[PDB]
Write an enzyme that holds these catalytic residues in place. Structure first.
Site, PDB file in Angstrom:
ATOM      1  CD  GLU B  51      -2.717  -1.210   2.333  1.00  0.00           C
ATOM      2  OE1 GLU B  51      -2.335  -1.314   3.658  1.00  0.00           O
ATOM      3  OE2 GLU B  51      -4.101  -1.238   2.338  1.00  0.00           O
ATOM      4  CD  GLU B 127      -3.187  -7.763   1.601  1.00  0.00           C
ATOM      5  OE1 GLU B 127      -3.804  -7.277   2.389  1.00  0.00           O
ATOM      6  OE2 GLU B 127      -2.040  -7.131   1.286  1.00  0.00           O
ATOM      7  CE1 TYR B 128      -6.437 -16.160  -1.308  1.00  0.00           C
ATOM      8  CE2 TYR B 128      -8.670 -16.604  -1.763  1.00  0.00           C
ATOM      9  CZ  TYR B 128      -7.409 -16.960  -1.370  1.00  0.00           C
ATOM     10  OH  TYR B 128      -7.264 -18.594  -1.227  1.00  0.00           O
ATOM     11  CB  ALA B 129     -10.421 -15.125   1.667  1.00  0.00           C
ATOM     12  CG  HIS B 130     -10.268  -8.921   5.660  1.00  0.00           C
ATOM     13  ND1 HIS B 130     -10.798  -8.485   6.803  1.00  0.00           N
ATOM     14  CD2 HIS B 130      -8.996  -8.572   5.543  1.00  0.00           C
ATOM     15  CE1 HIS B 130      -9.878  -7.656   7.416  1.00  0.00           C
ATOM     16  NE2 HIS B 130      -8.812  -7.624   6.801  1.00  0.00           N
ATOM     17  CG  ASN B 187      -8.750   2.625  19.234  1.00  0.00           C
ATOM     18  OD1 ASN B 187      -9.539   1.893  18.618  1.00  0.00           O
ATOM     19  ND2 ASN B 187      -8.893   3.364  20.046  1.00  0.00           N
ATOM     20  CG  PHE B 191     -10.678  -3.384  11.026  1.00  0.00           C
ATOM     21  CD1 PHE B 191     -11.653  -2.686  11.423  1.00  0.00           C
ATOM     22  CD2 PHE B 191     -10.420  -3.780   9.585  1.00  0.00           C
ATOM     23  CE1 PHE B 191     -12.860  -3.004  10.752  1.00  0.00           C
ATOM     24  CE2 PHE B 191     -11.859  -3.814   8.941  1.00  0.00           C
ATOM     25  CZ  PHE B 191     -12.862  -3.313   9.598  1.00  0.00           C
ATOM     26  CG  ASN B 194      -7.575  -8.539   9.948  1.00  0.00           C
ATOM     27  OD1 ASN B 194      -6.974  -7.839   9.335  1.00  0.00           O
ATOM     28  ND2 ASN B 194      -8.559  -8.256  10.798  1.00  0.00           N
TER      29      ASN B 194
HETATM   30  O1  GAL Z   1      -6.361  -5.629   8.113  1.00  0.00           O
HETATM   31  C1  GAL Z   1      -6.908  -4.926   6.765  1.00  0.00           C
HETATM   32  C2  GAL Z   1      -5.794  -5.196   5.646  1.00  0.00           C
HETATM   33  O2  GAL Z   1      -6.129  -4.429   4.684  1.00  0.00           O
HETATM   34  C3  GAL Z   1      -5.098  -4.723   3.537  1.00  0.00           C
HETATM   35  O3  GAL Z   1      -5.343  -3.750   2.315  1.00  0.00           O
HETATM   36  C4  GAL Z   1      -3.645  -4.408   4.006  1.00  0.00           C
HETATM   37  O4  GAL Z   1      -2.722  -4.577   3.092  1.00  0.00           O
HETATM   38  C5  GAL Z   1      -3.419  -5.241   5.226  1.00  0.00           C
HETATM   39  O5  GAL Z   1      -2.204  -4.920   5.442  1.00  0.00           O
HETATM   40  C6  GAL Z   1      -4.436  -4.974   6.138  1.00  0.00           C
HETATM   41  O6  GAL Z   1      -4.187  -3.482   6.568  1.00  0.00           O
HETATM   42 MG    MG Z   2      -2.758  -0.974   5.590  1.00  0.00          MG
HETATM   43 NA    NA Z   3      -4.675  -6.371  10.216  1.00  0.00          NA
END
Ligand code: GAL
Ligand code: MG
Ligand code: NA
Ligand code: GAL
Ligand code: GAL
Ligand code: MG
Ligand code: MG
Ligand code: MG
Ligand code: MG
Ligand code: NA
Ligand code: NA
Ligand code: NA
Lengths: 1011, 204, 193
Positions: B51, B127-130, B187, B191, B194
């Site tokens: 990011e 990154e996928y499937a939070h 804060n 979040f 995850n």
């Molecule tokens: O926990 C939310 C996630 O969102 C993503 O976009 C970011 O790259 C991760 O580091 C984390 O911030």
């Molecule tokens: Mg971030």
């Molecule tokens: Na996080």
């Protein structure tokens, strides 16, 4: 906390680089590019004191002026002021190679200046100081308090003084270090100086200001429409009432204009630049920019309020032009260029490396006058004014970052080290951010001689991302690395390969077709013009014109880097390597120009002009065909001027106006030319003339020319035998022929004509003998030195072979009487340690008409380096004021550099038959001469010659042209054959085979007589 | 192996990464990682960070790694996941069939992305499937697609373990704490949790 | 001369990065990847004292251990020791966005260690110290004398101590700044320690 010995610290508190600013507070002043009240110059008289190291600088200096100091002019190089010696070294670093450390004894120049600031500048906005050039690093103090630090001798360093200045008197303290870690990236082959050599300024900007702007111009396929895109960035308080208005001006006319508030487009998930805005103006049928026609517009950037109040305005000249490499070709506005360029160091014979408008404009005019259209900023960003001039006068520029480390081993030891990525980065990025708006800049260069490291690739890609409008190039690592869009070798020959390991130099013609290769090839350096050079230059152009992808190159180089010194009497003379006690030094290798330090042309400049013509001609009977090599302009300021002449004697002439479209052809039908009668050779000669004066040319300037051998009439009517007959007298030591007034004497002990008489007047001061050597040219010497001998250099091969010290042994010397003339027959054998090097058989025939016919027939050992020449020489007793000859001239010309010379009758003062090359050597030769006239004498045949008051011996024993003393009489060197001078490079045999006296057996005939 | 570079807080996101003044600092976070780990066989791809929009610096450093180490592909999701600074289309949270046409940096359906005019690279979500809390719904859809599409070569779930810290109440008993639970402010609530497993590696 | 507020200075006297070393003096040990005598660990109990800003660090500390200090285990995060709170912020920077400047009130952790060096290490070769991870920037002193500076919390910083060490007792002074210009590149969505 030594900052000059840490490549990680290249500056401290220095502001961001950016296009040229002036902070006009009136849009009209901006549009007209008139002086700005917000831009003061701090140039003038400053206080200076020299020190052996920074550790010797007394604290008092920071706040109080040293009385021991002197008042000197700034900008300048303290070496030029005599505070210490300027050093001249080529490759080998001037300091000890031990990065990032520099000598403890580091010449430190302490500059100070007391000046005052208007109270209005301190009541508002930002007041900053700008140092365009400080060699090589420095610390800045304002009123005793420390401001910042800076490195990179070729780009400007700016600091915000707002909080240091007070109304009224103020004092600047600038400690300039000669050496620094930055010196490791500044190893260019030039005089090594230091100090504040470029303008110092004071700029006032509003608090809410314009901090940067980028101008771009994109066109449709036929260049009928174009979109000007201006990205503007600001600083200070952001407010909605803020606006930016970019307006494009064509003279007094306003072609387009756009206004918009700050707030760029969305670029990523976080939004966009709220402190930026991009304006896009349309332009129909724009006037395109080129070196042919530098059509410019004026872009004015205004920072104001919505209610119409101007806050500040900035501007720049805009040139609509598109540069792109497509399908292997470098295109300028869609057409494939042919770079007629040259490398140009910022050098002044008296001011060191300090540039001024006058010297610049001068060079520019000379360049354009000699058909040059491009220049390479070897090897660092140039003074800001230069780009402005090239913009307006019309010149394609290669802007090159200040990075050369040729002294390292291997050459890329630093450029491949990530630890040095930072230092390099700034020398590339800051150049781009500064000059990116100049239309004359068409290519970006990553530096010079620094091998090929990863850093180069990283920086290469950066420029490509930041500025897609220009191609990037770099010769390091082999000229065709992944860090260059153009195959840009240096000194790669036309047909001959130089298969060096790792980084070979292929024949430029072979290079283009190497498997997989597809890029365009433009030499970044070629035709080393050191001394009597530029031989074989025509071959390069022959090739440039025949091969689409062979798009030219940059000659090396423009002006001799010689400095002016004075002898006891106070007279000036050109000095070079070592002449300042500087050591180690690299002899005269700093003088490689087409012109002397004082901008006086060298003979070679003329050859260049000719080969780089923009008009090509072909002849077919009565028709002359003119082809234009221009890509844009029409021949709207030219007229062809022709003339036919029988061995100098003109007969007919005329002139047809030229109406040729770029790339086009025009046929010219000459009227039934005059039918010659007398015996001789008819020569058609055409010259293209510019009737109207331009910005760079006088009226009636000649831009091109060409000769053609029309018809010829061999004389059949042999001379009418006179009744007089020569009388032969015979001693045991001489053969004396007398005829009327004339008297000839052949010393039977030598086998040479030892003396002649016209009355009781002697004619020779030295016997008429054969000569097979010549005062070694720079190209004949290469890099061979006194202690370090290069056995390969022509001069060494000759020396070793014994040519310079050959004893002429007499084989035969007889005399016979004929029905109407005496006949002396000689035959000599020049040897050395037994080996017979040359054999010279001759026969002198003095007849009733009193004419001596010398017939020479030489033999050369097929296993002794080819002789530098094959002719005769003697020291004449007379010293006439003029020299007249029928042959190639008027200027000095040699076998491999005589295309530019024309055949005709030339008459010049004895002095012009001598070329003042700073380093003495064989010179002034004139080839293809059928008739030579000096004093009572006249020589006829088909020879080459040079005539002056200096003997080949003196010339080869003398190091500087100012130590040459005229000798008794006039030395005559008549060659039947002369080896080429070469010049593809000056550090290895560079004379093409076809120009090497290798035939083994040669023959020439001369006729000496009294005119 | 990913360089230590994230500036998601800047505005726009690439304000630093596109500023040549910051090329040095970034440079060292990329080069020193490569010089350190370049010999490990488990490292198969180099990442330029996270990011941080897409600035010139990214392109410069991208090319550096390519010159220094040809053995591994380089990737970076900044600037839209398919910039000139990445050998792999590596979006984050781009859905399987649904497009999210955000301006400048849209997240196309991973299936639609592969066939965009001119595009030819392989697509692997960085990154996928939070997996935040009771999540991972629709996870099977991603795999269905991964197996059917040759160039849909997988991804990296976000993420492994909950970033919860242990605190103790008056009695001295431990409990999982998150955003704000330490007086920290501002804060971002919970979040930081995850993961597919709790801070103590207990599966979710 | 604040180095933690200048993105142009990311280190001072730090050695070059490189693959994992152990300097085995026996090839068999190398092949079998067994411990190396030339690679000692300085992990364990160190001396630590927290400060509100570097400007509050008493000079005495450079040469003499502060009695007010505590003995803590290293490696570790002082937030986890309760010296100050760990912050959890996602995107929004933990400090005020104004590059390259950081808060005047910059939590400074003062770590120190007294250890001794074998005399054989100082009779020859090079003796260096390796910090695999310091969040987020720090200055190093060895026996009162200053060695160097370093940034980038996730890669190791190495310095040549050869000319600072003496046989026997030696003392390390490590001033660790919580915030620094390098923090601008360390804005990951995790606990800020
Ligand atoms: O926990 C939310 C996630 O969102 C993503 O976009 C970011 O790259 C991760 O580091 C984390 O911030
Ligand atoms: Mg971030
Ligand atoms: Na996080
Ligand atoms: O005449 C020697 C020349 O050699 C070139 O390679 C170099 O780029 C020039 O700057 C100059 O040193
Ligand atoms: O630049 C290329 C060459 O230039 C010469 O002047 C120098 O003597 C050579 O060693 C090499 O540097
Ligand atoms: Mg430095
Ligand atoms: Mg050089
Ligand atoms: Mg010709
Ligand atoms: Mg810093
Ligand atoms: Na061509
Ligand atoms: Na030179
Ligand atoms: Na005309």
């Amino acid at each position: 906390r030594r900052d000059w010995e840490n490549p990680g610290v290249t500056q401290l508190n220095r502001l961001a680089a950016h296009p040229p600013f002036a902070s006009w507070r009136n849009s009209e002043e901006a549009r007209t590019d008139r002086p700005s009240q917000q831009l003061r110059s701090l140039n003038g008289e400053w206080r200076f004191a020299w020190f052996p190291a920074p550790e010797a600088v007394p604290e008092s200096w920071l706040e109080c002026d040293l009385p021991e100091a002197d008042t000197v002019v700034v900008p300048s190089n303290w070496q030029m002021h005599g505070y210490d010696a300027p050093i001249y070294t080529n490759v080998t670093y001037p300091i000890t190679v031990n990065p990032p450390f520099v000598p403890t004894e580091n010449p430190t120049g302490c500059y100070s200046l007391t000046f005052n600031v208007d109270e209005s500048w301190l009541q508002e906005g930002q007041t900053r100081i700008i140092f365009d050039g400080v060699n090589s690093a420095f610390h800045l103090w304002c009123n005793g308090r420390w401001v910042g630090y800076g490195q990179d001798s070729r780009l400007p360093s700016e600091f915000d003084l707002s909080a240091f200045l007070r109304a009224g008197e103020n004092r600047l303290a600038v400690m300039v270090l000669r050496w620094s870690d930055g010196s490791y990236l500044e190893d260019q082959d030039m005089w090594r100086m230091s100090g504040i050599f470029r303008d110092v300024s004071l700029l006032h900007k509003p608090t809410t200001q314009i901090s940067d702007f980028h101008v771009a111009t994109r066109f449709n396929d036929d260049f009928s429409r174009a979109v000007l895109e201006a990205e503007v960035q600001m600083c200070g308080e952001l407010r909605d009432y803020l606006r930016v208005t970019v307006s494009l001006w064509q003279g007094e006319t306003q072609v387009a204009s756009g206004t918009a508030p700050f707030g760029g487009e969305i670029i990523d998930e976080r939004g966009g630049y709220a402190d930026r805005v991009t304006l896009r103006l349309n332009v129909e049928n724009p006037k395109l920019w080129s070196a042919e026609i530098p059509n410019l517009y004026r872009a004015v950037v205004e920072l104001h309020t919505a209610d119409g109040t101007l806050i500040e305005a900035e501007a720049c000249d805009v040139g609509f032009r598109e540069v792109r490499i497509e399908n292997g070709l470098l295109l300028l506005n869609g057409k494939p260029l042919l770079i007629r360029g040259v490398n140009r160091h910022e050098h002044h014979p008296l001011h060191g490396q300090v540039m001024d408008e006058q010297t610049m404009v001068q060079d520019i005019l000379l360049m354009k006058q000699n058909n040059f259209n491009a220049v390479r900023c070897s090897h660092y960003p140039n003074h800001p004014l230069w780009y402005t001039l090239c913009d307006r006068y019309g010149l394609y520029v290669v802007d090159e970052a200040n990075i050369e480390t040729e002294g390292m081993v291997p050459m890329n030891r630093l450029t491949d080290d990530p630890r040095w990525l930072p230092a390099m980065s700034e020398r590339v990025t800051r150049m781009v951010q500064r000059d990116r708006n100049h239309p004359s800049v068409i290519i970006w260069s990553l530096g010079n001689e620094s091998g090929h490291g990863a850093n180069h690739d990283a920086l290469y890609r950066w420029i490509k991302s930041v500025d897609p409008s220009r191609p990037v190039q770099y010769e390091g690592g082999g000229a065709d690395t992944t860090a260059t869009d153009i195959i840009c070798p240096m000194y790669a020959r036309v047909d001959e390969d130089q298969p060096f390991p790792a980084v070979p130099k292929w024949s430029i013609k072979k290079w283009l077709s190497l498997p997989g290769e597809t890029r365009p090839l433009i030499l970044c350096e070629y035709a080393h013009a050191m001394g009597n050079s530029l031989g074989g230059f025509a071959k390069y152009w022959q090739a440039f014109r025949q091969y689409p992808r062979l798009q030219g190159g940059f000659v090396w180089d423009w002006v001799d880097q010689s400095l002016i010194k004075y002898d006891e009497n106070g007279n000036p003379w050109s000095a070079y390597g070592g002449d300042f006690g500087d050591t180690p030094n690299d002899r005269q290798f700093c003088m490689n120009g087409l012109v002397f330090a004082d901008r006086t042309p060298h003979p070679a400049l003329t050859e260049a002009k000719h080969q780089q013509q923009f008009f090509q001609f072909r002849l077919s009977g009565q028709t002359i065909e003119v082809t234009s090599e221009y890509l844009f302009r029409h021949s709207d300021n030219e007229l062809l001027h022709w003339m036919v002449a029988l061995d100098g004697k003109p007969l007919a002439s005329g002139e047809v106006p030229l109406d040729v479209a770029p790339q086009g052809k025009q046929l010219i039908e000459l009227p039934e030319l005059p039918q010659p009668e007398s015996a001789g050779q008819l020569w058609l000669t055409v010259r293209v003339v510019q009737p109207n004066a331009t910005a760079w040319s006088e009226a009636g300037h000649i831009s091109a020319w060409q000769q053609w051998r029309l018809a010829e009439n061999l004389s059949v009517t042999l001379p009418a035998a006179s009744h007089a007959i020569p009388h032969l007298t015979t001693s045991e030591m001489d053969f004396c022929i007398e005829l009327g007034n004339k008297r000839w004497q052949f010393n039977r002990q030598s086998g040479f004509l030892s003396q002649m008489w016209i009355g009781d007047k002697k004619q020779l001061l030295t016997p008429l003998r054969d000569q097979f050597t010549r005062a070694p040219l720079d190209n004949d010497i290469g890099v061979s030195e006194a202690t370090r001998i290069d056995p390969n250099a022509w001069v060494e091969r000759w020396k070793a072979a014994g040519h310079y010290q050959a004893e002429a042994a007499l084989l035969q010397c007889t005399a016979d009487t004929l029905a109407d003339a005496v006949l002396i027959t000689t035959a000599h054998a020049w040897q050395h340690q037994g080996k017979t090097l040359f054999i010279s058989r001759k026969t002198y025939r003095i007849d009733g008409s009193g004419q001596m016919a010398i017939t020479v027939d030489v033999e050369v050992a097929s296993d002794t380096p080819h002789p530098a020449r094959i002719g005769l020489n003697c020291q004449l007793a007379q010293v006439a004021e003029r020299v007249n000859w029928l042959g190639l001239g008027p200027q000095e010309n040699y076998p491999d550099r005589l295309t530019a010379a024309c055949f005709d009758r030339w008459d010049l003062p004895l002095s012009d038959m001598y070329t003042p090359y700073v380093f003495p050597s064989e010179n002034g030769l004139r080839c293809g001469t059928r008739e030579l006239n000096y004093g009572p004498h006249q020589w006829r045949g088909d020879f080459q010659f040079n005539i002056s008051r200096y003997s080949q011996q003196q010339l080869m024993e003398t190091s500087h042209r100012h130590l040459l003393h005229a000798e008794e009489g006039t030395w005559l060197n008549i060659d039947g054959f002369h080896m080429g001078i070469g010049g593809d490079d000056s550090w290895s045999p560079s004379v093409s085979a076809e120009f090497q006296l290798s035939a083994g057996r040669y023959h020439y005939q001369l006729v000496w007589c009294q005119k």
